[PDB]
Amino acid sequence: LMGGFGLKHPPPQILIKNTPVPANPSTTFSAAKFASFITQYSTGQVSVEIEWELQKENSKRWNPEIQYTSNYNKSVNVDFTVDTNGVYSEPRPIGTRYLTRNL
Amino acid sequence: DGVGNSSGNWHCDSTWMGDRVITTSTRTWALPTYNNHLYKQISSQSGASNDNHYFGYSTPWGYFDFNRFHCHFSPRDWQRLINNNWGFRPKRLSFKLFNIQVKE
Prior knowledge:
- The structure is cut from a larger assembly and holds 2 copies of chain A.
- By secondary structure, chain A is largely without helices or strands.
- In chain A, 0% of the residues lie in helices and 0% in strands.
- Chain A contains no helices and no strands.
- The radius of gyration of chain A is 26 Å and the shape is elongated.
- The A-B interface holds A 59, 61-65, 67 and B 74-76, 78-79, 83.
- Chain A: It comes from Adeno-associated virus.
- Chain A: This is Capsid protein VP1.
- Chain A: It is found in: Virion.
- Chain A: Belongs to the parvoviridae capsid protein family.
- It is classed as virus.
């Protein structure tokens, strides 16, 4: 209902966790499990690549279509670009339906 | 060949192969008789301005000029070429005259 491609076998979930590292266990033995660990985090790059297939547009309509066009009027901030403080902002939602096929 | 068999088929199409686009266009023309089949020189009437004098000949012949773009490109085919491409140049053309009929 939200949108997109209903799949029976979606791209599988990728779960990730830091392996816990204990911290300074006492010398004498105790059965209770460790309540204290090294405080640590991890970081690194992630690369996702998807190959899309397209349906080429083949039509005979005479007059020109509607297209998605960023307006040419001068403004303080360009759309879809960083501002002066570095905060990237999307100005408006972009639907996918512009080209016109006859019903 | 003959009066009954037609000489050529109407081709008006635009195909976008990949790098190259092939634009075809077909029209129907009508050619009168100019100057009653005789040459004439023409020149500036009496006089008007020094700049506007001209001398030349007017032949009975007539010619085809497809030199404008919109002959070849439909407004939509123009929109595709214009929005998706940096540059375009022509490569080769072919010209065809068919189904001629003379009427008296």
